[PDB]
Design a protein around this ligand. Sequence first.
Ligand SMILES: CCCCCCCCCCCCCCCCCC(=O)OC[C@H](COP(=O)(O)OCCN)OC(=O)CCCCCCCCCCCCCCCCC
Ligand SMILES: CCCCCCCCCCCCCCCCCC(=O)OC[C@H](COP(=O)(O)OCCN)OC(=O)CCCCCCCCCCCCCCCCC
Ligand SMILES: CCCCCCCCCCC1=C(C)C(=O)C(OC)=C(OC)C1=O
Ligand SMILES: CCCCCCCCCCC1=C(C)C(=O)C(OC)=C(OC)C1=O
Ligand SMILES: CCCCCCCCCCCCCCCCCCCC
Ligand SMILES: CCCCCCCCCCCCCCCCCCCC
Lengths: 298, 100, 322, 475, 131, 162
Amino acid sequence: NLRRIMMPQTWKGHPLRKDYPARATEFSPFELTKAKQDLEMEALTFKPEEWGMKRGTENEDFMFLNLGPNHPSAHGAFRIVLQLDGEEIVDCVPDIGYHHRGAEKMGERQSWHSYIPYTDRIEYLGGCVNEMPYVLAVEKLAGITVPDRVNVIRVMLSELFRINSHLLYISTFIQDVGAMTPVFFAFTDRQKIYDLVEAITGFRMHPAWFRIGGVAHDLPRGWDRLLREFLDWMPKRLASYEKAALQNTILKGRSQGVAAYGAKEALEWGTTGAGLRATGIDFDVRKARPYSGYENFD
Amino acid sequence: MIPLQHGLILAAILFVLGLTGLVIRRNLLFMLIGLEIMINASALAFVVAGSYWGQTDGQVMYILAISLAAAEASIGLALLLQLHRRRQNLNIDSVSEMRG
Amino acid sequence: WISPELIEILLTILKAVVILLVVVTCGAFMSFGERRLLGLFQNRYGPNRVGWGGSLQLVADMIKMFFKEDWIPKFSDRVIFTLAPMIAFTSLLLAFAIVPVSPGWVVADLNIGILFFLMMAGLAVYAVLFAGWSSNNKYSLLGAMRASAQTLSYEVFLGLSLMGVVAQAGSFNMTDIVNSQAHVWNVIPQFFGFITFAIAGVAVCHRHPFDQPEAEQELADGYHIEYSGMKFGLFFVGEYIGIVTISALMVTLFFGGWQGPLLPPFIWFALKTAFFMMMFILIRASLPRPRYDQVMSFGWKICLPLTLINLLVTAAVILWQA
Amino acid sequence: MTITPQNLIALLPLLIVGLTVVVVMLSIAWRRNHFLNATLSVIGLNAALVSLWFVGQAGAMDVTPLMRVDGFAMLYTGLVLLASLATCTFAYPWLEGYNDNKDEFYLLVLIAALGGILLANANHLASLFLGIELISLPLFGLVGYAFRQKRSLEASIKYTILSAAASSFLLFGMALVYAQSGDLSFVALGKNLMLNEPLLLAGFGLMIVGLGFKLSLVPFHLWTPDVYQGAPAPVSTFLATASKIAIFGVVMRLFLYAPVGDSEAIRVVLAIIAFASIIFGNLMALSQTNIKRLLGYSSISHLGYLLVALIALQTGEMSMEAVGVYLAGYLFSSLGAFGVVSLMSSPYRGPDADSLFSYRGLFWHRPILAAVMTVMMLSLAGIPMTLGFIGKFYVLAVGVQAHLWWLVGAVVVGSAIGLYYYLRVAVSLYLHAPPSNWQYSAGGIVVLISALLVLVLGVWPQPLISIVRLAMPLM
Amino acid sequence: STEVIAHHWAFAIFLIVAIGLCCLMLVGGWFLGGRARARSKNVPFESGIDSVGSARLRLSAKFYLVAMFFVIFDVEALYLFAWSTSIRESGWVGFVEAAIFIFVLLAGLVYLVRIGALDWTPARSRRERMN
Amino acid sequence: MEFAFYICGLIAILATLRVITHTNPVHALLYLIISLLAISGVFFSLGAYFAGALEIIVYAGAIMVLFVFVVMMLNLGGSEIEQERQWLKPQVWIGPAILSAIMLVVIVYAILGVNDQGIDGTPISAKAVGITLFGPYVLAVELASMLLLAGLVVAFHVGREE
Ligand SMILES: CCCCCCCCCCCCCCCCCC(=O)OC[C@H](COP(=O)(O)OCCN)OC(=O)CCCCCCCCCCCCCCCCC
Ligand SMILES: CCCCCCCCCCCCCCCCCC(=O)OC[C@H](COP(=O)(O)OCCN)OC(=O)CCCCCCCCCCCCCCCCC
Ligand SMILES: CCCCCCCCCCC1=C(C)C(=O)C(OC)=C(OC)C1=O
Ligand SMILES: CCCCCCCCCCC1=C(C)C(=O)C(OC)=C(OC)C1=O
Ligand SMILES: CCCCCCCCCCCCCCCCCCCC
Ligand SMILES: CCCCCCCCCCCCCCCCCCCC
C-alpha cells in the first residue's frame, strides 16, 4: 500500500524535492472555505476497503473507531483507526503525518547555526538530547574536536533532559493506567530540573543552547548548588513513585504481559531504546558507540 | 379494602396482553418479552390470592414463578443467540421447515 | 388545623425536606470538596480564589452550568437522552430516603430498607445504559457496554454482602440494624461483608477505580460525551449524591450509624459519613484502574464466594449463640 | 412440620439423583471425561433404583406438605428411572460422534429425572409446578443439544416457547384455584364447597391447558411431531417416555385426591379431549413417512387411551391399576422403538435416520433390530401376545365398567387406524432395500430386553398385574 | 397509627420534591444562556474526523454468557435474602437447608469457572508472556 | 392503599399494552421496566412487601441483560424499526384480538362469581416468607436450586460461539 503518509491524500507534488518551495509564504495563505473543509474532511475519512478490512462478519458488525487525533491517550496529533469486534482489536491502522512540520526541508532552508532551534523541536521532551547528534554531525563536517569541559557540559544537560523526559513518561504511563496522582509530583520534580536548566540555558523546554564547537555560554556561578539540590530531592521522590504506583498489583495487572514482543520482533521493526533492551539485547549507543565523552562515566 | 376480584381481573388482563404479544410478534425477542409478561401476570395472580387469604404461600409461589422466569429467559436468550448466529434474523416464521 | 397529629405530620414532612435539601447541597459542595481534597492529597491547593477559600467556586460553577448551552443532539433519541440524567439524579437520592441520620430523623422507616437500596441501585444502572445508547456516539455505546459489564461484576454479590448484617439484626429495617450495633459495630463481625460492600458500593456509583463507563483515558469520558450544560451537571451531581448515600449506608450498616459515646448522634453520623466521603476521594486519588474483564473475574470468583461463606459462617455463629 | 430421618429415608431417590447431579457436575469441572461422567450418571440412577427397596421398607407417609411417598410414587419413580437409564445408554453411542462437549447431556438427563421423581411424589400445587419445570427446562437443553443442526434448533425453540406458554397457563390456573380454595394441597381443592364453582373450574381448565400441552393432548398437541423429529433420538426416547409418564402420574394423583375430580363438567371436558386425542393422533399418523413424527402422533393417541382410563377414576376402582399396567407396557414399547431409532442414528453424523426408506429392508443388515422394532409396532398397535394389548384391554375394561361408550368406540376406531400405520412400518422392515463397541451392544441389549419383556408380559401378564396392584397410594 | 402516616407523607413529599427539583434544574438549564450555530455542530464527536458508519450497529458484547449467569445468580441471591432475615426462627434445620442450597450454588459457580464459561478475554490480552 | 393499587394497575396495563404494540426494542424495554415497577407498586399496595421488592430487584437486572442483547443484535437505526413495522398489519393483530378478548371475558366471568371479602392489605413480612420458605417449603428451595442449575447448564451449552 504505497500511499502518502505525511501529507494528505489530496496533496500535489513531493515536498522534499529541490524544486518544491519550502516556505508557506510561497503559496497562497491558508483559506478554509466550506468546500475545502468538506473536501479535506472527506479525504481524512477512513476507507476500510483501501486497507483490506471488511465491515464485519455475518454475525456482527465491526466498529471503526477514531482513536485520535483528539483523544486523551493519543500523545499528540495522532489517529489510530481501530477495527473493533466488541472491545477486541481485529486490526488497527495508525494514521500519522498530522504533526508534520517539514523539519528536514527546513534543514535545507536554514544555515548550519540557525537550524539548531529546529533540532530542539524534533523530540520536544528531549531538548539538548535532540541538539547533541546535530551538533556532533556538524562538528564532524567542520573538523572540530570539542574540549573535555564541553563534553561534560553536554553530557550533564543531556542527562538532565533524559531525567525530565523519563519523569514525564513514567508519570503519564501511571496516569494512563488509571492512577492520576504521581503526575503532579513528577512535574514538581521536572520543575526542579527546570530550575537548573533555566539557570544554565535561559529556557525551559527548547534551550537551543548547544553550539557548533561548544555551548552558548559558560556555566553560571552557582549551578552546582542547583544540581546538588535536585540530586538530593530526586531519589526519595522516585522511591515514593515506585512504592505507591509501580508496585501496585492493579498497575502490574494492567501492564505485565501486555503488548509483549521478543528480540526478533524488536529487530525486525527497528525498535530501539527501552523496548529493545527489554527484549534482552544489550544495545545502548552510549556504550556501543560512545560519543561526547560518555566513556569517562561509569 | 381492595376486592380480590379486582386483583384477579388485573392479573388476567396482564396475562391476556402478554399472550397477545406472544402470538402477534414475529421477532423472537418480543415473544420472550410476552412470555415474561405472562409469567409475571400469573405470579401477580398468586400474590393477590396469597394476600386475600393472609398466607405466605402466595409470595412463595411468586418466588418459584420468578425463578422459572429467570431460567426460562436465560434459555430463551441462548436460543435467540443461536437463531441470530445461524440465520442472521430473528423472524420466528423462518424456523418452520418441519411440517406435516 | 390545630391538632397534635397534623403538626407531627408536618414536622416529619419538614424533616424529610431538610434531609433532601442537605443531601443535594452535600452533593454539590462535595464536587467542590473533591476538588479541594484532591488538591490536599496532591500537595497543592485546588480552587481557593473564588470567594474566601474557594467557597464561591460552587456558585460560579453552578452559574456557568446553568448559562451553558444545554443542548439535545439531532442524532439522539431525545426523550431517553433527557431521561437518563433524571435517573442518575434521582435513584440514589431515593436510596438515601431510608438512611436514619439521627434518632427520629429518617424519611422512610421501611420494613424492606436495604431491599429498597438494592432496588434503587438496580434502577440506577439504567441511567448510564440509556445515556450511552441514546446519544448515538461510539464512545458512549462502548461506555454503556462497559457499565453493563460492571453491573454484572458487582450486583451478583452486593446484597449478599449486606446479608450478614441483615442476619445479625434479624431484620431488613435499618433502625433495627443500627440498634443491633449498640455494643459492637458491624465492621468487627461482618468485616468480609464490609470489604465486599465497599467494593460493590464503589462500583454502584461508577466511581474510580470502577469508572469504566466514563474512562477518560480510554473512552474520552464515555457515556456522557454528548451531554452538556445542566444534564452533564445532573450526571455529576447524581454521582456525588450517590457517594453521599453509599457512605451513609456504610456508616449505618457497618459503623453503628449515629451511635457514639460523647457527641450528639448526628455529629457521630456526620463525622463517619464525612470520613467515608473522604475515603471515596482518597481511593480516587490513590489506586489505579483495573481492566473490566479483571473486575468481572474478581467479582464472580472472589467476592461472591466470600459473601456466601460469610453468610454461612454468620448464621452458624448466630445459631450457636442462640 | 419438619423432615424426620424416616422422611429422609423416603426421600432417597431424590437425594441420590441430586447428589449425583452435583457429583457429575463437579467431575465435569475437574475434567471432561465422557466415559466417566456417563458411568457416574448411570451409577447414580441405578443407586436410586435400588434405593427404592429401602423406600418401600420405610412405608407410605407425608414428607412436608409438598410430598407424599406411597407405592404409587415408588412405581412412577421406578418408571422414570428406567427411562432415564435407557436414555443414558442410548445417548453414549450417539454422543460418541458429537464433536462438542458431551458431558452436559447426562447432567440435563439427571435433572430431568429429578423432576420426574418429584412429580411421582408430588402432593402439592407447588410440587406439581416445580416438577413440571424441572422436567421441562433440561429438555429445552436436551432437545437442542445438537443446535448446530436446523431441526434440533427448531425443535428446541418450539418446545421452549410453547412450554413457557404452557407453564404460564398452568401457573395462572393454579393461582385461580388457590384464590378459590385457600390451600395448595391436593386434598383441599374443593373442600370448602356445589362443587362447580366457576373460579375453581376456570383454574382447573387453565391447568388442563398446561398439562395437556405436556401430555400432547388435543388441541395442545401440535408441537409433538415437530419436537419428536427435531430432537436427538435418545432425547426423543426420554421425551416420549419419562416426561409423559411422570406428568400423567401427577395428573392421576391430582384427580384422585382433589374433590373437584368428581365434577361432571371436568369429566366431560376430559372426555372430549380424550376422544379427539385418540381419533386425531391415529388419523394424523396414517400418511407419515418419518418414523419420529409417526411415533409422536402415536404418543398423542396413547395418551388419549390413558386419559380414557383417567376419566373413570372416580367411578370404578380398576382405573389406577389400568394406568399402571398401561404405562409399564407403553414405556417398554416406546423404549424399544425409540431405541432402535437411536441405535440406527448412532454415532451422530448430523441428520438422524428417521425416514421410513432408511428402515425399509432393515432385516437384511440388522435382523435383531428389525425383530425388536416389529415387536414394538405390534405392541403399540395393541395386538395380543404383546403388553400393549394388555394395556388396551385394561383401558377397554375400565371404559366398559364406567359406561363410557363413546370412548370405547373411539378406542376401537383408533385401534383400527393404528393397525394400518403400525403394520405398514412393521412390514416395511422386511422388504428389500436398494457399532463394534460394548456401549452400542448395551443399547442393543436394552432394546432386546424391552422386546422380550413386551412379548413375555403380553403372554403372561400376571406378575405385572400383581406389581401394579401392590403399588397402591394412600386413599 | 400517626408516625407511620407521617412517614408515608414524608416519603411522598421527599420523592415529589426530588423529582420536581430535577425537572426545575433541567428547565433552568434549557432556557438560560445562548445557543451555538455551526455547520458540523450536530455531528457526533469522534475525535475530530468523520465516522465510518455510526453507533447504530450490531456490536457484539463478549460477556453475554455472564449476563445470563447473572440473572440466574440474582434469583439464587433472593432465596438467600429470604433466609437471612429469619435465621433464628428457622434454626439449625434451616441452616442445613441453606448450606445445601449454597453448596449447590457454589458447585455451579465452580463448574462455570472451570469450563471457561466465565472467560471472555482475547488470547493476546490474557497476559501469559511475562518476564 | 386502594389509590396506589388502582393507579399502579392502570399504569401496568397501559405500559404492557404499549410493550406488545411497540416497534423500537429499547423503548419496549423501557415500557416493560415501567410496567414491572407498576406491578411492584401493586404488590406493595396489597401488603406483599417482599414480592414487590424482589420484583424491582430481579427485573432491573433481567431487563439489563435484555438491553445487552438488544444492543448486540437488534439496534441498527431505522432498519429494524421499518422491518418490525412492516411485520405489524391491521389483520395480523385483529386476528388474535378477539381471541384474547373472549379469553379475558370468560376468565373475568369466572372471577366475578367468586366469594370476595376484600383484601385488607395487612403486610405479610419477608421474615414470615422466609420462615415458610425454609419450613414447609424446604424441598421447593432445593429443587429450585436444581432448576436454576439446569438453566445454567442449558445456557452454557447453547449460548456459546465455537
Ligand atoms: C463507603 C464506600 C466507600 C469506601 C471507601 C474505602 C474502601 C474503598 C474500596 C475500593 C475497592 C477497590 C477494589 C479494586 C478491585 C480490583 C480487582 C481486580 O480486578 O484486580 C485485578 C488485578 C489483576 O487481575 P488478575 O485477575 O490477576 O489478572 C487477569 C488478567 N486477565 O488483581 C490484583 O491486583 C489482585 C489483588 C486485588 C485486590 C482487590 C482490592 C482489595 C480491597 C480494596 C482495597 C482496600 C480498601 C480498604 C479495606 C479496609 C481496610 C481496613
Ligand atoms: C447393573 C446394576 C443393576 C441394578 C439393578 C437394576 C434393575 C433392578 C431394579 C430393582 C428395583 C427394586 C425396587 C423394589 C421395590 C419394592 C420394594 C419392597 O420391598 O416393596 C414392598 C412393599 C410392600 O411390602 P412391605 O415392605 O412389607 O410394606 C408394608 C408396608 N410398607 O411394596 C410397596 O409398597 C410397593 C412396591 C411396588 C412399587 C413398584 C416397583 C418399583 C418400580 C418398578 C418399575 C418397573 C415396573 C415394571 C416392570 C416389571 C417387570 C416384571
Ligand atoms: C490533569 C491534571 C494534570 C495532569 C496533566 C496531564 C498529563 C500529561 C499530558 C500527557 C499528554 C501529552 C504529552 C500529549 O501530547 C497528548 O496529546 C495532546 C496527550 O493527550 C491529550 C497527553 O495526555
Ligand atoms: C446545582 C448544580 C451544581 C453543578 C456543579 C457541577 C460541578 C461538577 C464538577 C465535577 C467534576 C468534574 C466534572 C470533572 O471532570 C473533574 O475532573 C475529573 C472533577 O474533579 C477535579 C470534578 O469535580
Ligand atoms: C457529611 C454528612 C452528610 C449528612 C447528610 C444527611 C443530613 C440530613 C440533615 C440532618 C439535620 C438534622 C440533624 C439532627 C438534628 C438533631 C441533633 C442536633 C445536634 C447535632
Ligand atoms: C405464516 C404463519 C402465520 C401464522 C399466524 C397464526 C395466527 C392465528 C390467529 C387465530 C385467530 C382466531 C380468531 C378467533 C376464531 C374463532 C374462535 C376459534 C375457533 C372456533
